Symmetry: C3
Subunit: 145 residues, 3 copies
């Protein structure tokens, strides 16, 4: 009865918040997932989170989301965003809304981060708002429904 | 005494034929392998099929094909065709004929699919003929040996 | 005692296993032995790691961050020219990182001319064959002390 949203954390994201606190902050993947769960309860949906450093494991989770008729997918694939055509063609299989998000303003960083290979297979993109990027992406998917 | 040919299916190809039949058809990897097995028997050769979504598993299968003195290799690496230099340098270890193939006319799709990073390490390429691309590739490999 | 980590990249398990006349016989085992011999001479410890999985490489780099490795040597193979995932894993490190190659990559195919690691390494050593590894270990020890 409840809509299911899948959160896909990308390569190197298990290391969020484990670097120098003064320069990189302390936000961890665990805190992000808690904030997503907090907002999900108010929105009346379920959020399941998945993190991997393996491109094949990411694609196979996407395949599973297609077969399990997931209602919406949020993805911050990390560096994969800028070259992994395999994940791009995995996301293309999905028929539910796909929301791309980034904590940082990728369009103002190194040139290679300015381009996303997912642009044609996602509804839209959100970047630059830190932790709030995740919550805004969850909001975007729920409003799509 | 029989020649052994290895068929390498690439990333996301386990999902062949599991999408909308009206838009994507119903051709599955299982149906492809059966038609390959039928042609191999008619041609007097052996065909072994392998699919993976892991770039390392694909490279390691190629290493195994080199050590096992495989007679010819057919590869449809999927999206890996357009960026995986790792699979490219794996194919370069082979000394048997290598045939690159695609079901679709990749040179008439998105620009990133126009270029194959395998071009310098394969005998040639076959694309655009759907199921027949696999059967033509097997014929090409047998004639190369 | 100072610890240096040697990271061997994709396809490198096949070093020395190709045609000896054309590709030589230098193996990863022989390289690691020479590294251990020089490490004892230099008064440091060397640990070697090889993988064909991009995710496994990034996770070894995460472990190198947690274990407070003194220096990292990396010859990522073909990943050098496209794996932004490994690049962003290396960016987490705060110890000196030395990129190395046996061949003169800047005089090979154009795609090998560029390393996506250049902004996250101290420097690069290429072209000196087996000596590239030994020179890189010397570079890393001098960077620490
Ligand atoms: Cl609200």
């Amino acid at each position: 009865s409840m809509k299911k949203v899948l959160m896909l954390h990308g390569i190197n994201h298990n290391m969020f918040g484990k670097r120098d606190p003064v320069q990189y902050g302390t936000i961890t993947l665990s805190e992000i997932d808690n904030r997503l769960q907090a907002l999900a309860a108010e929105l009346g949906v379920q959020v399941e989170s998945f993190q991997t450093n393996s491109e094949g494991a990411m694609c196979e989770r996407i395949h599973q989301a297609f077969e399990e008729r997931c209602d919406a997918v949020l993805i911050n694939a990390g560096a994969w965003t800028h070259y992994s055509y395999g994940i791009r063609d995995a996301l293309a299989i999905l028929t539910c809304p796909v929301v791309e998000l980034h904590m940082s303003n990728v369009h103002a960083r190194e040139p290679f981060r300015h381009h996303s290979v997912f642009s044609e297979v996602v509804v839209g993109q959100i970047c630059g708002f830190g932790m709030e990027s995740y919550l805004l992406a969850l909001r975007a998917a729920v409003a799509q429904s």
